[PDB]
Amino acid sequence: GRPRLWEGQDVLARWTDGLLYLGTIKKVDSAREVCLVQFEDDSQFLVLWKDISPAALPG
């Protein structure tokens, strides 16, 4: 099926405080179903696919 997440995509990621933060996907890890997401302070963390939403879908 058409990929939902990809490298370079602007996304909202749910963090461990239960809140959403703007980020950019830097790496997709398919086996682990995670992406390395770079946040607005340039910190980079693993987030599960289900906790990532695309910022914009064309539509």
Partner: peptide, 12 residues
């Protein structure tokens, strides 16, 4: 971003 600050899209 260089110098950036994380803020949540919404606060509690």
């Amino acid at each position: 971003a260089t110098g950036g600050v994380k803020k949540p899209v919404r606060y509690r």
